[PDB]
Amino acid sequence: AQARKLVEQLKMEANIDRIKVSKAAADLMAYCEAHAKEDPLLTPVPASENPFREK
């Protein structure tokens, strides 16, 4: 009962489409340097617009 449903679950996980590692890593990197000028952690934003300042 459990073994047959495990077999069919893992065999329907078998037949799915896969793109190459190069394409997925490439567009992950492309997403990385498409928002790089927006992320405040990578490039520290000026303290004038920073809402976390000493009072």
């Binding site: 077999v7 896969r18 793109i19 590692v21 997925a24 890593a25 997403y31 990385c32 952690l41």
Partner: protein, 335 residues
Amino acid sequence: QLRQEAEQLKNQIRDARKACADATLSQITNNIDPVGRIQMRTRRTLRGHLAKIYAMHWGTDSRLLVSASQDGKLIIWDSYTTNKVHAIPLRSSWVMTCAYAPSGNYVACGGLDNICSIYNLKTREGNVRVSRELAGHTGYLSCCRFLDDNQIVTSSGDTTCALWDIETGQQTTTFTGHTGDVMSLSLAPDTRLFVSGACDASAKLWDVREGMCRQTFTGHESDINAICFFPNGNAFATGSDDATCRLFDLRADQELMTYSHDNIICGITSVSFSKSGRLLLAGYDDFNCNVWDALKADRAGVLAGHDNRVSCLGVTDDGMAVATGSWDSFLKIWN
């Protein structure tokens, strides 16, 4: 019998994965400039807990977060002015999960009481009440996430995930298939998928709609303690106990990048991503968070200042903050 059939077609699956690999992520990012060394300072220390913090979730308004500890208190903080907006007295002190709704109207918690409590933050009386308690699980509730105002997905100790409906209290969908205790789940940015990891050192992606596992990822060997989707939803990162964070993948279904070092042999409790996705922040058991480069697999900086083990972590939605809660009743927001 059919055990050999399962073994040989699993052999077919990871043979297809091996044939699908032609270049690692190291070689495709071997020419980009690194982030170098980044320095982050604690602008806000959120004192007010008196016990061991275990969970933290930010808010969509990027200003209010919530954290839970072992004193039976669920404190909604303020990142801007350091103000305790709410502090709910919990009916179960043993909790290690807390969630914050995308609308900001609801907050969740759960733990060894097998109950996913939901609290209404904007009742007509002005205080915080209890709306619905989600019963049906037989194990400790490790991570819950709010899909919307109506649905919430939970990971339990009974090796099954569950999708709930708030006004009925019934699991509309059950996500079975884990041969081990699921400890963390992360919702997709498009709220159509979610991926969870378990003690069997495997991660599984599920469809919220049709309720069946699509992919499995067996990169880790110890367990899975944390998991977090990429901002675009095409990858995720996994924390574990063998001193390794692994960046898995969806459309290619392998282990892309290994974030491990030979001096940080402690475990990992928490992972999060920034807005750009280039900065994977991971909490560790050696009392400090490590900041990793999600493309170069090297440490950029260390978030010290916690004298006890870091337990929970989260990057805010607009990327301007990183809150780390740890086992010393304090939270720390960094820039």
